[PDB]
């Protein structure tokens, strides 16, 4: 009678770049090699990032064919959309097929779709495209979530939750996907917000299948259960994150006190979701914190007092992929369940009963989804 | 147990223009009086449109600064967004306050918000802004439906339906709002899809309160009961409507066979929806069809054999407000119940029991929402 995660799939584009070689690549293919001062500010953040590699659609050749994207301030939304209109629902398809395989059921049994992305937008949306790409039924009930940032991962789950629970027999396909072709910019002295993003942002795609009352006889296997899903605006945070969709693509602004505002308010958000269960100790849980850089983790960590033991899964994704936007949190969920089977843990939650999903985005906004593990045999 | 409409509220900008005087206004304030031949076609279209007046935020002086918006092809997305980022949620606020006045409950009772808009987008979205303007709780669960076109009105009804029915005591605030500053273009000889759109689009905004199990003792009153809600892709209609968000704004393209596709495929949707109610006679129902111009309405009615008696509310909205996009279907619902009280009809559905809200848009896509009337006292 409660919603459950029945399958999980992930994927990234084949092309990847090592962080050790990114500063040279980023300044060479923007003809900004002469900005010696910025090359140092950027390099220091790369070292502090503790990110090893990132996947990208954008290659050295594709940027040569799109100088508008390679020039800061220049109009390029025309060229950016030509790429995103196709590659985003396509990368999603790759992920959906992996999760539909584990599910091991007929395509016709899918009745809903929830697509979440900030990378590109048009009409019809990616939710129509992937419906035709996967060959789903023409009567699937779709819900498109455009431009909700990095918390959209928690949003998608909250929407799918009420869908599966209010429609008997319902099976929901959820897809998160991103592509740095939307937010890529060349270095600029006045707008140093870019510097932080270009040493962080990557792309990827995750896919989930939600459904109530798992049919064990049919071959369905629950992975996580969803007990609750809340959303909260953070007090005194107006303006901390703002992103505009201009002719130059997405132009974003970061205030110097994003982490302190999240840090000094996360305690209250946890207290609300977990009192119905009588939980107080924050180390009795498994976590899937949105990897919004080391600061956000190492800072949400200290406040709640989370030991390094429980941040292994979240820090692992950050290191091997970077910030993939809304797909980061589903990536970390797949990380746990799989790591748990290898290490012989009693449950899919690293041997723990309850866990939490933390998504962070503009507002400030915080999405909190309470999860429950299942036994491993 | 079953979601119900509890209140309705609408509004428009004060500034309006008569269809009588729009062709002069259009070719004058875009510096295009030298296109005399093109002006006559427009004139003809404006006369066959059955639209009497439309309300716009865009006045003659506002176009006078942002000449980019008044010049076809020119990059003007920035200027459009500076307008839409503020004016759209401000227009929604004015509508919501009317619905809460009728609802007659404390603002602390609202638990969810659903906003749908194609006109403009940023981060955080217009769901955050309307949450601050109305002074709602920081812990409200909100959904942002961007760029779902003219069927978004029915989608907003379907999401809110599953939220209110899956959450005890939950009360959902629906808001739809559109602004022509996104779709405004100067006349061009080549792109004749633009010319037909300028005689159609308007500004407006509507609001509803959705909740399951009305509390009579708390002063709540029902208006319509939501029995079901569906979505469907039309077979073999790929590319019938496409819209791109380029640097010039929302560039849309309409192929020549849009009406014949909706016309011949709508019957299957109605049969699937009303079959479990034992209904087949389409004139025994009240309607709220999306007025995408005369063409759509006449084509849909001609197939199902709907008489002019049951299309008065639809045409009245198109005649007095023009095509406002996603808000049209909400306007018609309000005219239905308001007209019903004045004429002495026994129900909010023109005396009838069951009715249907039809949302049409790109895909092609068809949103059907079976509705039930309540007794008038």
Author numbering:
A (entry chain A), B (entry chain B): 18 to 394
How is this structure described in the published paper?
Type III PKS catalysis involves the loading of a CoA-tethered substrate onto an active-site cysteine followed by chain elongation via iterative decarboxylative Claisen condensations of malonyl-CoA. Linear poly­ketide intermediates undergo a terminal intramolecular cyclization reaction to produce the final cyclic polyketide product. The five-layered αβαβα topology of secondary-structural elements of each monomer is consistent with the ‘thiolase fold’ originally observed in thiolase and present in all known structures of type III PKSs.
In contrast to BIS, benzophenone synthase (BPS) generates the core chemical scaffolds of xanthones, guttiferones and sampsoniones that are prominently found in the closely related Hypericaceae and Clusiaceae families. For comparative purposes, we obtained a synthetic gene derived from the gene sequence of H. androsaemum BPS (HaBPS). Similar to previous reports, HaBPS produced 2,4,6-trihydroxybenzophenone (phlorobenzophenone) when incubated with benzoyl-CoA. Additionally, unlike MdBIS1 and MdBIS3, 4-hydroxycoumarin was not detected when HaBPS was incubated with salicoyl-CoA as a starter substrate. The crystallographic models of HaBPS and MdBIS3 contained 772 out of 790 residues and 757 out of 776 residues, respectively. A significant change in the HaBPS cavity arises from the small-to-large replacement of Leu263 in MdCHS2 with Met267 in HaBPS. Similarly, the side chain of Met267 of HaBPS replaces Leu263 of CHS and blocks access to the coumaroyl-binding area of the CHS cavity. Similarly, the side chains of Thr135 and Glu195 and the main-chain atoms of Gly166, Gly342 and Ser343 line the sides of this novel pocket in HaBPS. Mutagenesis of Thr135 in HaBPS to Leu resulted in a reduction in chain-elongation steps from three to two and a shift in the terminal cyclization mechanism from Claisen to lactonization. Presumably, a similar water-mediated hydrogen bond stabilizes Tyr269 of HaBPS; however, the lower resolution of the diffraction data for the HaBPS crystals prevented the analysis of waters. However, higher resolution structures of BPS are needed for comparisons of subtle changes in backbone, side chain and ordered waters between BPS and BIS.
